[PDB]
């Protein structure tokens, strides 16, 4: 009847429990220790200025109403117990659209220690907004941020803290890289405060430093442009008594340059300035025209 005693413990634990009130509502500030494990770093959409990321989001706090004594020191409970207790309402400030996976069941986790400490872990995918500056494209680097914090709880009520040393609190899996066009140089974390129109909120920030790989653009744009420039200049060595041949050379080289210039931009967002690739294509077009 070990199940019976554990059921009795759980029933005594939720008796007279108001999940609408945070622990230490009027007499203490709730401190949520936070930890992120990145199981994969999804692709980066240059056109949409966003990036996908899969994580285990781990949150731990202390709830004094959930102290218990029994034959166990921890209670590994089914994830529907979390809906019966207070949990922090963390959200991602620069999140565009995220999903909390629930196949085949809600991908959630709740451990209660006998001293009242809780561990609450979720698996979720976040599409986050990463503003990009493409003046040095395709030789540019970016620091894509991930900002989260509490909705509706100001700094005076809920604060967030890294569970371990800040430099060790965001861990990226070894094989978890879905980056095709970029290279993940490392990650950085920080903590701060943002003043909103509803109060002062703690914000936890992570910065992922990404370096773009130039190879694709080399092969796809730079080599064709250099080749077209070489081909245009090859027309000089032809005899002057062959007007049709040199005319064909010039016109076809110009047409190829125009096609390449139209093609190159199609990969990038419609920014209002010229990138390094744009300058290279412009100079190649100038040489062909000359």
């Amino acid at each position, epitope marked *: 009847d070990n199940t019976t005693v554990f059921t009795r413990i759980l029933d005594r634990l939720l008796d007279g429990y108001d999940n609408r009130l945070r622990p230490g509502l009027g007499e203490r500030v709730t401190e949520v220790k936070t930890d992120i494990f990145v199981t994969s770093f999804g692709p980066v959409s240059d056109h949409d200025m966003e990036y996908t990321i899969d994580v285990f989001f781990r949150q731990s706090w202390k709830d004094e109403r959930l102290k218990f004594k029994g034959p166990m020191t921890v209670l590994r409970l089914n994830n529907l117990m979390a809906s019966k207790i207070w949990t922090p309402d963390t959200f991602f400030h620069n999140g565009k659209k995220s999903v909390a996976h629930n196949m085949t069941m809600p991908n959630k986790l709740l451990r209660i220690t006998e001293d009242g400490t809780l561990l609450y872990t979720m698996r979720l995918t976040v599409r986050a907004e990463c503003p990009m500056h493409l003046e040095d494209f395709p030789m540019d680097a970016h620091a894509c941020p991930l900002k989260f914090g509490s909705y509706a709880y100001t700094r005076a009520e809920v604060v967030y*803290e890294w569970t371990r*040393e*800040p*430099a060790r609190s965001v861990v990226v899996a070894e094989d978890g890289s879905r980056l095709n066009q970029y290279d993940l140089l490392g990650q950085t*974390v*920080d*903590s701060g405060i943002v003043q909103s129109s509803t109060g002062e909120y703690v914000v936890m920030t992570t910065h992922f430093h990404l370096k773009r790989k130039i190879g694709y653009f080399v092969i796809q744009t730079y080599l064709p442009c250099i080749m077209t420039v070489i081909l245009s200049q090859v027309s000089f060595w032809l005899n002057r008594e062959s007007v049709p041949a040199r005319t064909v050379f010039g016109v076809t080289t110009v047409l190829t340059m125009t096609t390449l210039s139209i093609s190159a931009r199609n990969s990038l967002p419609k920014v209002a300035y010229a990138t390094a690739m744009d300058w290279f294509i412009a100079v190649c077009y100038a040489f062909v025209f000359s």
Partner: antibody, heavy 116, light 105 residues
Framework: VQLQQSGAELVKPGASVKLSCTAS????????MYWVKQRPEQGLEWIGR????????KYDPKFQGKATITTDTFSNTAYLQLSSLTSEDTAVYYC???????????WGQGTSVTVS | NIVMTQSPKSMSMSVGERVTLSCKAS??????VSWYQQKPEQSPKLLIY???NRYTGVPDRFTGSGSATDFTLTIGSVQAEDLADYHC????????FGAGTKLEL
């Protein structure tokens, strides 16, 4: 709110010392406990760190092996076991508590350890 | 580790003047540097946590600033009880402390 350390003690070179740090007013399981070394007219030096709830420890690379840190959740105390003492181990050893963005808010009075 | 280069090594200033202590971080530490005041034969006392956050019971003249690698602690209108050592430490990684800064009159 209060961290009480053991009193000073004189030992001989090559001996072993086990310092004590008693926490009153809070549970050590709730935070990390730090041990810091201060030689005279010098800056502070982090010795190591322990997480009482898990028991795992981290040490400075220049103190690894020499020092051992342990706690006792029952008595709410932390220990620092120094081994193979040398003349340069004369200093004041502090016990500190992590809090509010890893700032080491509370410190012990310090123990003066000297080896003759 | 992360080396915290604290300057100047020492400094004297009369009572009523403004002083600025500076601390340099080797690598990036974000806003995870704290300032400690250690009076003679006493244990250190936390003054500033985060990077600009006065600990409870800290007078309003003390104030910190800085981010990334550069940090500073400006004591405006120092009094006679502000004579002590001032250590800067980073807690971004395993803690390291600056060599210290002695304040005389």
């Amino acid at each position: 709110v209060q961290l009480q350390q053991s009193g000073a003690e004189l030992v001989k070179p090559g001996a072993s010392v086990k310092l004590s740090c008693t926490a009153s007013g809070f549970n050590i399981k709730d935070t990390y406990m730090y041990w810091v070394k201060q030689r005279p007219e010098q800056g502070l030096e982090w010795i190591g760190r322990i997480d009482p709830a898990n028991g795992d420890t981290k040490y400075d690379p220049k103190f690894q092996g020499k020092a051992t840190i342990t706690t006792d959740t029952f008595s709410n105390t932390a220990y620092l076991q120094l081994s193979s003492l040398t003349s340069e181990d004369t200093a004041v050893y502090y016990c500190a508590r992590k809090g509010l963005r890893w700032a080491m808010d509370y410190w012990g009075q310090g123990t003066s350890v000297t080896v003759s | 580790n992360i080396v915290m280069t604290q300057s100047p090594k020492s400094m004297s200033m009369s009572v009523g003047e403004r002083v600025t202590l500076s601390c340099k971080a080797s690598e990036y530490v974000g806003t995870y540097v704290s300032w400690y005041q250690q009076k003679p034969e006493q244990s250190p006392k936390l003054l500033i946590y985060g990077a600009s956050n006065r600990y409870t019971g800290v007078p309003d003249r003390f104030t910190g600033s800085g981010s990334a690698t550069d940090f500073t602690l400006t004591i405006g209108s120092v009094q006679a009880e502000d004579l002590a050592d001032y250590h800067c430490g980073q807690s971004y990684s395993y803690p390291t402390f600056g060599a210290g800064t002695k304040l005389e009159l």
